Amino acid sequence: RRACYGVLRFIMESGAKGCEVVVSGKLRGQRAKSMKFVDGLMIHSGDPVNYYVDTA
Amino acid sequence: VQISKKRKFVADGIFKAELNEFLTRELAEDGYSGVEVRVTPTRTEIIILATRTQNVL
Amino acid sequence: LVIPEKFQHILRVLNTNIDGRRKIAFAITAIKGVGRRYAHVVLRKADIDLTKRAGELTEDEVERVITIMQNPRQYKIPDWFLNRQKDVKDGKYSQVLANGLDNKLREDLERLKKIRAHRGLRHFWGLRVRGQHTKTTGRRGRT
Amino acid sequence: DIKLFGKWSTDDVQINDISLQDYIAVKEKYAKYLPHSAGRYAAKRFRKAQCPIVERLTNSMMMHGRNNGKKLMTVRIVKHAFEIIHLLTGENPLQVLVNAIINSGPREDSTRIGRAGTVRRQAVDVSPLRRVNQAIWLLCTGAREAAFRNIKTIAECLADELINAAKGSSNSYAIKKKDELERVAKSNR
Amino acid sequence: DKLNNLVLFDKATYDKLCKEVPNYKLITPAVVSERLKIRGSLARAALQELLSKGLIKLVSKHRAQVIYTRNT
Amino acid sequence: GRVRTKTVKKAARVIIEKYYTRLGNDFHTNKRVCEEIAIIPSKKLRNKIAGYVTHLMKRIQRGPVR
Amino acid sequence: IHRIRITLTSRNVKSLEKVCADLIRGAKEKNLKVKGPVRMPTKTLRITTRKTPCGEGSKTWDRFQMRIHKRLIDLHSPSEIVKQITSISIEPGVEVEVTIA
Amino acid sequence: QSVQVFGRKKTATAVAHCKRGNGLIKVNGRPLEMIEPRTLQYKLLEPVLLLGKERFAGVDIRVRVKGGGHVAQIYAIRQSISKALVAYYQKYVDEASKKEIKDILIQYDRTLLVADPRRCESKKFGGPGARARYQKSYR
Amino acid sequence: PGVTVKDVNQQEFVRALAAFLKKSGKLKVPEWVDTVKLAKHKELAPYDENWFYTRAASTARHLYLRGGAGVGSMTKIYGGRQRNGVMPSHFSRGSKSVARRVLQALEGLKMVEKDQDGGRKLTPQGQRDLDRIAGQVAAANKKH
Amino acid sequence: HQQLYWSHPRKFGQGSRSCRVCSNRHGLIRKYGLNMCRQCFRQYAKDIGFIKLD
RNA sequence: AACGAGACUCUGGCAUGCUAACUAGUUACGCGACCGGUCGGCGUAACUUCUUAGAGGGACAAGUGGCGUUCAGCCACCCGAGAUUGAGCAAUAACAGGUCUGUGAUGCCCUUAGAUGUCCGGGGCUGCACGCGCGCUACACUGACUGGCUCAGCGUGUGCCUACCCUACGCCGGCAGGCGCGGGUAACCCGUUGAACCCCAUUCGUGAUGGGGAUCGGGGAUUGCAAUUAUU
Ligand SMILES: [Zn+2]
């Protein structure tokens, strides 16, 4: 939680119009949940996904 | 011997895919971002991008 | 193309009750060992028109088309037409007709059953021989 | 000026019924040299009222699966039928076509209402466009069903029902279905 | 029932072929086979001599259809 | 059907409200001025703004609009 | 020298069109007989794969494409000048092949 | 002194050459009667059986054609004959005669001047063609 | 009255040319005419026992309409649909010796010659009689 | 064991080709000289330049 | 206010307007050939209609008339190439869905030298009393056969390891094929991609027939190291 918040506050301070960080796995326990650390705007559909949102 | 135009543009791609995956596996904990391959008639230039270059060389 | 009168309605050739009112090329097909392809070649070798039916044929041209089925190789019918090209016993080129087709393929089959082979035994069980799958098909007549 | 297959003219063709006048084509400007037109009649509702009914009969002639694309096959079937019709009657062979389409379509159908296996229908009217649609269907399947395992060709079997529907005979397959489609319709009413 | 027909010319049916076949107004290889009880090849070929006889008009010749009418 | 979403209607409303003197009734000269006033990502949106403007300028002669 | 032929190929089109326009402009400014940029047909490289890695669901295929665009520009010019203006149009993605008659 | 127009169906492109001549209309160097689907000979001959031979007595038409099939090349030839005569009457006769040709050509069938724009859809995975889907089963 | 091969329907022109080649006599008819099928897809031997003259006519006419063809192109001309079993049908080619013993049979009447590009084309002496018989078939349909 | 173990003729066939990144032998794309798995092609497709347009 | 919808991106359709074409042509001119015709036969020039592919246009419910609290919009019609082309991408939240047999992704466990590694040889994965699914060929006359005629579009092609091809043309063969001999890393060659139904003629004649071809007996030929449980 703290490690995704640090990255998210850095990449929102640096002027990106919005971001979204997801950490999936068994971060605590034996059943494996996910996370969703999101902020700002975020486009999913259409053709501007190719040049406006940068995924990794 | 030369090669087809269909093969030359696909073999050009698999170069930069293996190059990039190798440099990912190498410099993933050195802040690596990507590569940029520019071909001159003299040489083929490969530009590595990184966060802190001065701790990569 | 007038009314015929000497109309041999049934031709008894090679112990077969063939038609007499079919065409002259597709009447000979009704014996075993002659298909639609072989009869045309023996009729063209006999120099008879194929417009005619089977009942207006004079007996000279009735016997001269049977005698080119007992030994076709004198009349330049090539070897790739024949029912058995390279026989396994005598190595002779012949076209086996109706009296001896069963009497030949029985000996071909039981030749493979004395030898105790992968094909004669497969014939002896009654299953499929040429390497077909046998799970889902061939169910008709089987219990 | 415009004769179908260059021989049969359209000026003396006379539609009888007022119910089918605005829907059955050629008398005036739907006169074509051939039934093949390749036009976009299915692009809107009611647009196929403005197509020549010779093309309607040609198009419904090719219904079964082995003949589904063959239009040049069915246009010569209709052309060869329009000789046998003229020989067996002696008049223009387009007046008999509208006499067959007028006569063959039912005028009272039954609409199906019930449950799974329960049938309790009820009689309704028949729109004249559905009368034209079901005229050509019964004619063409009568020609199709009575030429199947038979020495008679399709051109004779089409013509010998296309006149028998004009005469209103009950040996034709078309009028045999219309009177039963109205007989089971009156039976509820 | 099955169709027993005749492959060649009969003495009696050849009389039927020569006088009312020019009195039909529609002669076609699938009506002659049905009326006189013959096969289709007699209807196809025996009719084609009547064109040479000059007794029967030829309307239309096609692969799958042959239409003959009588003269006058 | 052919309903104009909030993008076309919002853009058309602001471009009427600011540039009413240049807009008239012809859709074509409306399109030639709507591509010089505004910076629209191109034509299939440009012709939809200019068509609601051409439907909206006829609505101003008959009285105010809400 | 007759038939100095410059072959230009890229996967994208705007950069290839930019390089081709700059080459014909830089050749026309030296007053050379320059044949126009001819456009050989566009070849599309299709590869259609199932989307799934295992083989389980609803038979959804993919449709990938690489398009290769090819031009030629032909020059009736001597060889000692042509190797100058092509060497300065250093742009990525576009590949130059020069042949002499 | 010459016209070149194109007619067009699904894939066929018949390109008609109209110069001042006598009236020999030729498809690929052969007469209109000998064109092999003769079931549609009247479909081929509609723009000359409509407007008469006298409106074609001053031209000479050599139609080339390639692409498509037989029916699609018939509907491309007769479109280019019409579109060639109309363009000849516009380029070397007046507009009035072009109108008096064009109204009869449009009144018969509009596909003698306006191209038919429908082409084959694309196959999709999941079925045998564009719209049709593979048969599915249950349980 | 300038007649060429294209000014008449070909289905009768081939019959005319076959009758002319049959009446000439000096056409080298092979030995296996009364035994073969013309391709590997046709299931029977052809009906007309003079099939070689009709075939040797239509090979020459396809050398009229476009020359430069050889035995490989003539295999693709005379190819059809192979109906094969319970598997779907497929286009199969013709023969390469039935289509080759016609081509050097037309050399036997010196009606063709091997062109410099590789295939076979017509000689001007062989372009004489094709137009002659095109005139002879275009002059015997309109008067009768 | 010298004329042996890597002895069998692997001059063609399914098990003389393998993926160039997986070294796996199944589901192989040999077209245009890719020689990748059908799964490893889909990972590196946009790097090669195969864009999904339609 | 934000996302998803829409916009967007590719594709289809239009342009005698622009840009240009010996690796696409048409028209014209001579030559040649056979009767002013026919040339996919030969070389020059006018040029881009046809062919290519780039920019830019073009369609917006814009026009007319009805109906809508005269609003959003719907319906019909003119003019039009066109008055919904077809796809791709696709939210939040989920599932005890599939995948450890795609990975040198990977936690735990099992095994690690008569090995659960790995190679070699031979089998099996195809085995059949029978159930259940996707399909191909059909049951014929709107047809089968044998001739004749005449039209496509999307594509692929000499390979790092790597052996492995598209093939014109001449000869020998019924044919499957076999010899040479050329072209092509390709808008240059196969290729004018001389496709199949379709179209035009002959035969067959409502019968388990010449429809239908399963199952089988003999030969012949390619592919391979190997063809027997039939590779084709
Ligand atoms: Zn892989």
UniProtKB/Swiss-Prot annotation, chain A:
Compartments reported by the entry: Cytoplasm; Nucleus; Nucleus, Nucleolus; Mitochondrion inner membrane
Protein name in UniProt: Small ribosomal subunit protein uS3
Quaternary structure, from the entry: Component of the 40S small ribosomal subunit. Identified in a IGF2BP1-dependent mRNP granule complex containing untranslated mRNAs. Interacts with HNRPD. Interacts with PRMT1; the interaction methylates RPS3. Interacts with SUMO1; the interaction sumoylates RPS3. Interacts with UBC9. Interacts with CDK1; the interaction phosphorylates RPS3. Interacts with PRKCD; the interaction phosphorylates RPS3. Interacts with PKB/AKT; the interaction phosphorylates RPS3.
Role according to the record: Component of the small ribosomal subunit. The ribosome is a large ribonucleoprotein complex responsible for the synthesis of proteins in the cell. Has endonuclease activity and plays a role in repair of damaged DNA. Cleaves phosphodiester bonds of DNAs containing altered bases with broad specificity and cleaves supercoiled DNA more efficiently than relaxed DNA. Displays high binding affinity for 7,8-dihydro-8-oxoguanine (8-oxoG), a common DNA lesion caused by reactive oxygen species (ROS). Has also been shown to bind with similar affinity to intact and damaged DNA.
Post-translational modification: Methylation by PRMT1 is required for import into the nucleolus and for ribosome assembly.
Transmembrane intervals: none
Residue positions where N6-succinyllysine is found in the record: 17
UniProtKB/Swiss-Prot annotation, chain B:
Phosphoserine: residues carrying this PTM: 4, 33
Compartments it resides in: Cytoplasm; Nucleus; Nucleus, Nucleolus; Mitochondrion inner membrane
Modifications the protein undergoes after translation, according to the UniProt entry: Methylation by PRMT1 is required for import into the nucleolus and for ribosome assembly. Sumoylation by SUMO1 enhances protein stability through increased resistance to proteolysis.
Domain of life: Eukaryota
Outcome recorded upon mutating residue 4 to A: No effect on phosphorylation by CDK1. Greatly reduced phosphorylation by PRKCD. Abolishes phosphorylation by PRKCD
Modified residues annotated as Phosphothreonine in this record: 40
Family of this protein: Belongs to the universal ribosomal protein uS3 family.
Subunit and partners: Component of the 40S small ribosomal subunit. Identified in a IGF2BP1-dependent mRNP granule complex containing untranslated mRNAs. Interacts with HNRPD. Interacts with PRMT1; the interaction methylates RPS3. Interacts with SUMO1; the interaction sumoylates RPS3. Interacts with UBC9. Interacts with CDK1; the interaction phosphorylates RPS3. Interacts with PRKCD; the interaction phosphorylates RPS3. Interacts with PKB/AKT; the interaction phosphorylates RPS3.
Name of the protein in question: Small ribosomal subunit protein uS3
Region of the whole protein represented: 3 to 59 of 243
Curated annotation (Swiss-Prot), chain I:
Organ and tissue specificity: Higher level expression is seen in the colon carcinoma tissue than normal colon tissue.
Any Gene Ontology biological process: maturation of SSU-rRNA
PROSITE patterns in UniProt: RIBOSOMAL_S19E
Pfam families linked to this entry: Ribosomal_S19e (PF01090)
Described function: Component of the small ribosomal subunit. The ribosome is a large ribonucleoprotein complex responsible for the synthesis of proteins in the cell. Required for pre-rRNA processing and maturation of 40S ribosomal subunits. Part of the small subunit (SSU) processome, first precursor of the small eukaryotic ribosomal subunit.
Involvement in disease: Diamond-Blackfan anemia 1: A form of Diamond-Blackfan anemia, a congenital non-regenerative hypoplastic anemia that usually presents early in infancy. Diamond-Blackfan anemia is characterized by a moderate to severe macrocytic anemia, erythroblastopenia, and an increased risk of developing leukemia. 30 to 40% of Diamond-Blackfan anemia patients present with short stature and congenital anomalies, the most frequent being craniofacial (Pierre-Robin syndrome and cleft palate), thumb and urogenital anomalies.
Protein name: Small ribosomal subunit protein eS19
UniProtKB/Swiss-Prot annotation, chain J:
Molecular-function annotations in GO: structural constituent of ribosome; zinc ion binding
Predominant cellular place of this UniProt entry's protein: cytoplasm
Residues carrying Phosphoserine: 7
Record's disease association: Diamond-Blackfan anemia 13: A form of Diamond-Blackfan anemia, a congenital non-regenerative hypoplastic anemia that usually presents early in infancy. Diamond-Blackfan anemia is characterized by a moderate to severe macrocytic anemia, erythroblastopenia, and an increased risk of malignancy. 30 to 40% of Diamond-Blackfan anemia patients present with short stature and congenital anomalies, the most frequent being craniofacial (Pierre-Robin syndrome and cleft palate), thumb and urogenital anomalies.
Family that this chain belongs to: Belongs to the universal ribosomal protein uS14 family.
Gene Ontology terms describing biological process: cytoplasmic translation; translation
Full protein name: Small ribosomal subunit protein uS14
Pfam families, A to Z: Ribosomal_S14 (PF00253)
Subunit and partners: Component of the 40S small ribosomal subunit.
Compartments where found: Cytoplasm, Cytosol; Cytoplasm; Rough endoplasmic reticulum
Positions of post-translational Omega-N-methylarginine modification: 10
